[PDB]
Every structure is written in structure tokens, then in C-alpha cells.
Design a binder for these strands. Sequence first.
RNA 1: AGUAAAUUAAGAAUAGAGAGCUUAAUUGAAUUGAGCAAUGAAGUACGCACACACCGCCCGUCACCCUCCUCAAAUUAAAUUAAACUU
RNA 2: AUAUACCGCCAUCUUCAGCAAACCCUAAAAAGGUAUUAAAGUAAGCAAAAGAAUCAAACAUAAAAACGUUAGGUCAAGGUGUAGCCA
RNA 3: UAACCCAAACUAAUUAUCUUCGGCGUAAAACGUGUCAACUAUAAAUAAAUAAAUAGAAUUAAAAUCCAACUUAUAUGUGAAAAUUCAUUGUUAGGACCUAAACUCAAUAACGAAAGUAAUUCUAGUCAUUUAUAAUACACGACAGCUAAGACCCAAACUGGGAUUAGAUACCCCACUAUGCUUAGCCAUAAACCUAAAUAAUUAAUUAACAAAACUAUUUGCCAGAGAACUACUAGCCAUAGCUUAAAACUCAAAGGAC
Lengths: 191, 108, 72, 323
Amino acid sequence: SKNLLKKFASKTRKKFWYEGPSLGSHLTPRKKTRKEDSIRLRVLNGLLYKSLTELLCTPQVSQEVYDLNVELSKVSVTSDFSACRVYWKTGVSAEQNKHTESVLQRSAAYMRHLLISQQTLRNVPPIVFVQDKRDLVLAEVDRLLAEADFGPPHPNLCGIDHEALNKQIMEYKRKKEHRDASPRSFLLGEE
Amino acid sequence: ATLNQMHRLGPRKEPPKRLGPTEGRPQLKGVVLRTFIRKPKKPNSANRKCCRVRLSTGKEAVCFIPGEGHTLQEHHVVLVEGGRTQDLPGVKLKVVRGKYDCGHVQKK
Amino acid sequence: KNVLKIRRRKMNHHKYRKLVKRTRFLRRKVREGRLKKKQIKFEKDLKRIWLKAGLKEAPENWQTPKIYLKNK
Amino acid sequence: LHIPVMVDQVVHCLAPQKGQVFLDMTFGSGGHTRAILQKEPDVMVYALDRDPVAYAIAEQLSRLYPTQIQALLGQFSQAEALLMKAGVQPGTIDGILMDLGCSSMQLDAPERGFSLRKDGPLDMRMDGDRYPDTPTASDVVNALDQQALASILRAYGEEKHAKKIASAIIQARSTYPISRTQQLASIVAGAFPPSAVYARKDLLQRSTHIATKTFQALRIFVNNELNELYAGLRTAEKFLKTGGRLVALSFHSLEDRIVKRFLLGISMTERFNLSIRQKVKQTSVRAPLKWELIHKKVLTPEDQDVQDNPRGRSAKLRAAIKL
RNA sequence: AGUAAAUUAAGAAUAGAGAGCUUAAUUGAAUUGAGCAAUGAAGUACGCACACACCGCCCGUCACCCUCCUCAAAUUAAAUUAAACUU
RNA sequence: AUAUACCGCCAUCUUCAGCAAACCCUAAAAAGGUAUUAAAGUAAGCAAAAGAAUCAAACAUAAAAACGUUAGGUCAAGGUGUAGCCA
RNA sequence: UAACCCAAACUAAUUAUCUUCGGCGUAAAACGUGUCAACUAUAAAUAAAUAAAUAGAAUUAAAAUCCAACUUAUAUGUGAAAAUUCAUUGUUAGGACCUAAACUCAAUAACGAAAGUAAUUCUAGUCAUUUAUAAUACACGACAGCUAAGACCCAAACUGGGAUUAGAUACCCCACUAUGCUUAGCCAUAAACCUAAAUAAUUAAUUAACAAAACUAUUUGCCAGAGAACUACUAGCCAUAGCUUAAAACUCAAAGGAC
Ligand SMILES: Nc1ncnc2c1ncn2[C@@H]1O[C@H](CSCC[C@H](N)C(=O)O)[C@@H](O)[C@H]1O
Ligand SMILES: [K+]
Ligand SMILES: [K+]
Ligand SMILES: [K+]
Ligand SMILES: [Mg+2]
Ligand SMILES: [Mg+2]
Ligand SMILES: [Mg+2]
Ligand SMILES: [Mg+2]
Ligand SMILES: [Mg+2]
Ligand SMILES: [Mg+2]
Ligand SMILES: [Mg+2]
Ligand SMILES: [Mg+2]
Ligand SMILES: [Mg+2]
Ligand SMILES: [Mg+2]
Ligand SMILES: [Mg+2]
Ligand SMILES: [Mg+2]
Ligand SMILES: [Mg+2]
Ligand SMILES: [Mg+2]
Ligand SMILES: [Mg+2]
């Protein structure tokens, strides 16, 4: 009789859904921007964010990776869908991050297998693990700072050039001291 | 509406035809009281010649004087007719040229 | 679907409410006097009835009720 | 007569006491200076003004207190030299009172040209015969072009209608010289229809003339009060004792901004946004504050009092201690 | 990048007249991102009461003249009635 | 006199990528017309590209750059429409 | 100047002749809700049968508040500040309170005429008129508001204080009222909007657009260019700066809906 979902069913149907049995060219393993592509890539980034967190903090990948307990900063797939860029949260310790980077990357192939096997995502492209460049720079600006040595222990204000205006005044003081488209032509015979 | 509702109400009620400046009469005779200029509402630009008159009914109205040039003055007698002046708001009467004191436009 | 027709009514009601606020005291005196005339008209209409019927005085024990005054 | 406005707030804020040296950079009529010398008869005070008439008033009033008041004549920029000629006697000044605006005597007297309501010459120059070559408002209006003249009205008078008002002055001066205060007022009031002559109601809920902004603009430009004020506050800080209390009164926003920005470490140089994407919030500073603001909180005089002195309605009292 | 910079020569037009112009040659660098917070452009999505196209459109208080209407203290003005019954 | 009647010769976005014409399609079309593992678009012109120039070769530089935008500039290069002067 | 129309007429003004089987999601138009009559239509013999209707009583988990012990020197607050505050702050498996409001469940779609209703328990309780169709009657009706007596954790018009600004009677910060709560009564208004009256059929012999596919029949209500106008006057009302009912003059040649 009264359905709360009716209010927003038609609005969310153009924002979060497209019609027709068409899959994108990118989504294949091997142009003009479309709205369906934005939907087809937004949902994958959410599924992979949900599904790639069910591997890092779960025991399937490995015992060391399970112990790593890697939370993820964000997941973002390329528009071409050639590969993925799984950003991961990066602790302050640079050395540990370097080791964690290598560990995750080695299991990238197996992690993909785990998702593809479970059937959450049928055709997942190769995965990558990247460190946020912002985080790396902030760490580097701290490393170099520690290494670094600090050594041994009026008219223009208001906006009117009062001086120039005074000269202009003193200088002045020195001087002081729809019709042709009708059928008329056709109906007369002027051809 | 249903056939029962059309029966209970019958034909549509017709608002009465309210009268205009001439009060449902072809013409009225009036005495000029003042002669002045009225400005046409934009987008038009002119100094339209009008006059106030006291009609035979006893009311006073503003009447447009057509033609290029009139000799009307106060206390003159004129025969007014209907017809609004489209640019002049409120001017719903016009003077008849060639009747009583008002005369035909002098041809150039 | 714009709200333009709602905005015209919005301004009319706003301006009308401020007009009533300015002349609130005047409106009060108009009403008290309109009710008094409303009461006199009611009494006279009741006097017309018994006088037309032929009575020279109102029915015994009858006093016209004051129905428009601040009785409630 | 004009009572010194908000003097009680200044007097309490200054707390004049024996053995303290004070300065007044705007003696003018001397009402404020006399109030400081009444609370404490043993206080030491120095006076200054740009008007030679005002300086004479101080010299005449110096008889009342032979050494407690020291009279000086000059601008804010020339104040440092005048106090330097005296020597180090001002030295660590406990308080510098920098009241702003036109003197009661200056604007009450029609001859000085400050009053548009009265008919006088268009002098509008606080400086008297001390400098006879200082251009008056008559010279400013008759010389500057629309571009220059409009900027004076827009920048110093906060004139909303700057191009129309400026053009009327340029046309009027060509027809006849603009030499009288009322002549200029009519010229400014002629750029608009007759309805706008006296229409601009103020926050006071009292109507005012349409050329009040032109007189304020010319008043500040002829006397370059704003630029000279920038140097007066800087020289007060240099001459202000550590822990000394500064007190200023700002009757319009332009002077208030310099006093408001100065006492909070902000700079008048700061560029201006113009009502598009202003970052009031972001949806820092080179150094910290250099003052202990006894009364960062500002206020105008009481509205009842304002009726008695409408000139002082917009008086904002800004008090601070040197750090 | 043989660029900038520096330093030369010639030419046009003149009787003569440039610190200007056109052209040729010589010597000969530094630097180019872990780019897009902003500015501008392009693309995609969305909004629009704009189409003179945001330097757009647009709403109220205030101000004269003119049109119509309402209320209201009182005053007066005309209007408008209907019969009751005795002998 | 009028570059707001124009030709002529140019500036500008511009070394920007579009312009115009003939067709075809739409449960009507004010317009729009793409998917390559292809779903209504197609076959030709101008520009671009190519080519030529700087006398090997490349690169580079020049030149080239449509249709429009700014009633952009020029009646004083010359010519010319309209109006005006002719002791 | 030449053409055109009418013609002993011709043109102007005034007046009259044409009059409901059309509509009601978005353009005017389904009433805030339900019940009882009389007609006009219809024709079946049921209903209800523990998910949050409603009313009463009892009850309480979390988080606050107050009190106490101990305790930092600050606490609070913003984009950044200021004011405010140290009578504060943090902890308490300490005491009191039962004020106020009911996370998850709820990705559910139930109950009720609508309004509205979801912490737990118990008591009372929804149900059969064939069906549609009702006002001048009766009973209801969010929030805000009024009246009297209480409550008071938190929130908060107004107000005061602080910022911002050309100004800032605002947006932001802090404090604190009316008020939101209970018990009696009033008030009767919502974009009371699924912007869909109810009921019974049909899905094909059917694209104005958009929304929510089209469409027939029955009954009532409602609409008739826009503004003036949720207005003036009238009548009723516990309403008194109120609600319902609801015009005309005058102005305009459009207003309005969808794309
Ligand atoms: N730049 C400047 N230098 C010095 N004095 C100035 C000045 N600008 C304004 N003044 C003067 O300062 C005074 C300000 S108004 C008068 C206030 C004074 N305290 C009194 O009691 O009268 C006037 O006398 C004015 O002429
Ligand atoms: K016209
Ligand atoms: K040309
Ligand atoms: K709704
Ligand atoms: Mg209105
Ligand atoms: Mg030469
Ligand atoms: Mg041109
Ligand atoms: Mg080419
Ligand atoms: Mg031009
Ligand atoms: Mg020529
Ligand atoms: Mg020329
Ligand atoms: Mg409607
Ligand atoms: Mg405040
Ligand atoms: Mg309270
Ligand atoms: Mg209603
Ligand atoms: Mg509701
Ligand atoms: Mg209402
Ligand atoms: Mg009403
Ligand atoms: Mg009424």
C-alpha cells in the first residue's frame, strides 16, 4: 500500500544502474566516456575493497600475511581495466613498510586466485600494491631532516598612489597658476 | 460530471456582462474640463493628447483625442465613443472628430 | 517543478501578517463594534417576531440571550 | 559643545597615575586630554595635533597645568621628529591616545569647510596656515579625473556609486569652479534623481544626505589621514613603554581596520577578496600576537548617548598593551 | 639549443636624416617535476526560474503622480413596509 | 560624411579541428544519428595531413591554416554604393 | 501614387446572435480522516483468526544528571579564533535518581480511518452491514500555540555574550529561557502529498510528454484564463494578531505544464 522505497527507487535507478545486456570493452582481459562505465567501475572498486579486505585480515592468503593484518587505504581499478592499484595503509615505520610491501606483492597472484575461486569476482585482472606518494614524501622529509645538520648552536597600502595623485593635483595647480521568407517572390513569379 | 450531477446543476451559470465606459450606449456627450498629456506605457514613446470630460451621465472620464492636432479647450462640448487606447492605460474613451466643438483634422 | 506559485503566496501571507501586526489594536476595536451591531440586529429581529404576532410585550420570563459577548 | 566621547572608557583603560608619561597624538579641542589631567593632577602628558588652531588651544591650556601637558604641532608622521626634538622626555610612554576624526571646533566652524550642512569655503583641511601649499578639497575635486576622483570616493568614502558621482563633479567643475561646500553637495546630489538626496537611512535609523560619503572621502584624502595614521600607530608602538596601554577610537571602518589589524598582528597590506569563494572556513601566520588586548571587545557608544553626539556613533574603542 | 644572452656586419627607404626595422654571421649557456591545491581549456555527469544568455534573471522596505476598492466616528438624506379592530 | 553599404588587403581565437553540401534512418524529428567479438549511418569536397621551400639526408624553422567569432582595422593605398560642396 | 473591398451607400462605436455529454498525478480541479440518511447504481451471502493500532498499569538496559572518593592544572570551543571555565577535568566492578528518550534487530514493510504507531510484560481490544455513494450531524486529527498545576536529563525560538563582515538584527562559538514531558481543556492547521476519490472489470480488439502501462463502468465531490486573493464583506466557532466559508472592482494577453 505505502512503500518507503518507492520514493527513491527511480532516482537510484539512473545513478546506480544501467539497462541492457552489454558489458564494457574494458572489462575484458584484453574512447568515448560512458555513464555505464562509471557504474561498472564503481561497483568493482567496492567489491574488490570488500573482497580484498576478506583476504588480508583472513587466513586464506598465508600465515605471515594473516599476521600482517593489512588494512587498506583504498582500491582503484584502471579505466582500461588492464590492472588494479590496491593502495594499502602505511605505518610510520619506513623499514617495516618496505618489508610489508614485498610480502604483499609476492602473494598478489594467490590473492587474486582466492577471489576468483570463491566466485565473488569472476574475471579479476592483475593486482598491484602501492604506497601513497603523500605518505612516502612525508617520511622522506623526516629522514632527511634528521640527517640534516643545523650548524653550530603607505600609498600602496590604501591602494591609491597618494604621491602620484598629489603630483597630478600639484601639476594641475601649476597650470592653474522575417519578411523576405514569405511567399511573395514565389507567388509573383520572380524565379 | 455524471448525468445525475449535470441534471442537478443544469446549464453553466453565465456571469453578467458588466458595462464599460459608455455604459452600453453608442456615444455620450461630455464637456471638456482639462487638456493634458499622457505618456504611453513602455516600450512606446510619445506625448499622447488626452482630455478629461464630464459625461452626460455625470461621471468624469479621460478621453484620447485622435488625429494630428486639436483645438479643444475647457468648456467645449464633444461626442465621445468607445475603444481603448492600447498604449494608454485607463483611457477607455475617445473623442469623435467632426462633432460639436471638436472638428475634423486639418489636412496637410 | 518550480515553486514560483508558492513564492507568490509566501510573500502575500508574509506581508499580510505584518499588516495585521501593525493594525492589531485597530482591528480589535472594529471587531468589538461589529459584534455589538451583530447583537443589536439579533435583538431587533427577535422583537419583530413577537410584535408582528400581536404581542405588546415579549413572552413572560424571556430575556434575549447575549450570544456574541465574551461569555466563554 | 562636544563632550569627549567614550572618554570614561579611555580614562579607566589608561589609568593615569602619578609618575607616568602619556602622549596624545590628536589633541584637537583637548577634551580627552583634559579628562586625563583631571583624574591625576600629577600625571605627565604630551599633546600633538595637525591643526595650528588646536596647538594654540593646547598652549592656552598649558597655563592650567604648566608642565603636566606639553603641546606640539604636526602630523602623525612628524610626531616622531617632534618628540625626538623634545628628547627622551616622553621616552617610555605609558599610554598613547590616538583618537581619530575631525575636531569639534574644526567641523563646527563653517569657515573650515568640513561641514556640508553649512556654507563655507571647501577647505576641508585640518592643517591651517602651517602649510599653505597643502591642496584643499577644492583643488582635489577640480583637478582629479574621474578615475582618480572616483577612487577617492570608493576607497576612502566607501562610496557605492563612484562612477556616477565622480562624473557629475567633473562636469560641474567645467561649468563653474567648485569652491563651496554646499555647491559640492548639490553636485553630488545631482548625479541621482531628486528622490535620493536625503534617502540613505543609516543604522541609527536616522536619514542622512547623499553626499556624506564624498565629504568623508575628501576629508581623508586632503589630509591623507589613513596613510598618516599607519605611521602614527607604528610610531606609538616604538614610543610606547613595554606594558604600556594604547587606546584608540575609530569612527569609520577604514581607520578601524588599520587599528583592528595592527593590534592583532594583521597587516593593512593584506589583499582583498570580493564576495566570491571567500575562505572564511576551509571546508598559518608568520608570528603570534604582539599585544595583550585589555578590551579586544569593541562597542559603539550607547544609542541614547549617540543622539547627543551623532558624530561619534561609530566610535570603536580598541585597547591594547605592548608586548 | 646553436636557443637565450653577448658581440658584429649589411640592407631597405633619403639629397641628408632612427637608439627603429629587415636580414646574415660570431661566441655560447642554465634548466625542464614523485606536477594539477588553485587558474584556464577539453571531456563526462548533474542542476538551471538564464536565452540580452551570471556584466543574467530577480524579491522586499522607502519615495511622487494616477486608477479602483475597503474600513470607520458621527450627521443628515431620501427612501421601504404592514396590518390590529369596535359599533 | 558613413569601415554600421562595400571591394581590396589584414588582425584575433589559430597550427585551434573543424566547416559546408548530397543522401539515408526515427511509433516525429525542437533535434539526433556511436558501440570493431560493432547496435543506423553512408559516399564525395575545403581545412588539416601529405607535398614543396631553407639547393644530400633527416629533424627543425618558415610557409600553410577552412567555415565562423570581435557590425575588429582600414572611405587618408587605390576603387566604389548612398548623401553633400561646385565663386 | 497605384491597387483592393464594398457600393447609394460606406466606415466607427454600442448591442445582440454561437452556450454543460469537457476535465481533475505534474497545467484550474479527489475534500486531513472515518461513520450513520435519502436517491441512483450494483449482486452477493461473509468476516476475523499474536509482526510497531489504541488505552491502562507495571517494568528497565544503555547513555546522561546529581552526590561522594581520588585526581591533571587547566577545562571547553573553531576552518582559525574569541568568549566561556579551573565551583572545572579524568577514573570509580561507589551511592542516588527513575527525568527524558527507546541502539542493534530494521537489508523488515506490519498495524491503524487518517493522524500516527516498533524497549519489555500483563489486562482490555480490532471481526460478519452485498458493494459504491454524506452534511447543515457525530467522533477524530502531526508540529507549533493558548489555559491551570507539575516535571526538567538533554535539546532549544527569544535574549545576552564572543567571532565574522563595508554592515551581519544571520550562517559558526558559548550561556540561558518560552517550548518539547505529565495531568485536565482548548486550538483544528501541514508539501495533513502515493501531489493516485472509492468500487468492480479487462489486458486487446492502447505511446502528447514526463511520472505511476492503458482503459471501461457506477456514485459522489470538485474545476472553468492569470493576478488581485490562504484578501474584503457575511455567517459559524472555547478560536480575539485565529480557523473554516469566500467575492468584486481593477490590471494583463497571457499565466501555467512537459521536453
Ligand atoms: N594625521 C594626523 N596627525 C595629527 N593630528 C591629526 C591627524 N588627523 C587628524 N588629526 C587631528 O586629531 C583630532 C581628531 S578629532 C578631535 C579629538 C581630540 N581628542 C579633541 O578632544 O578634540 C583633530 O584635532 C584632527 O585635526
Ligand atoms: K515602439
Ligand atoms: K572590409
Ligand atoms: K509527498
Ligand atoms: Mg503579492
Ligand atoms: Mg640612417
Ligand atoms: Mg568592420
Ligand atoms: Mg600544411
Ligand atoms: Mg566598428
Ligand atoms: Mg577618396
Ligand atoms: Mg576618416
Ligand atoms: Mg493544481
Ligand atoms: Mg549576538
Ligand atoms: Mg526550560
Ligand atoms: Mg486545509
Ligand atoms: Mg504524513
Ligand atoms: Mg492558512
Ligand atoms: Mg482570512
Ligand atoms: Mg472574514
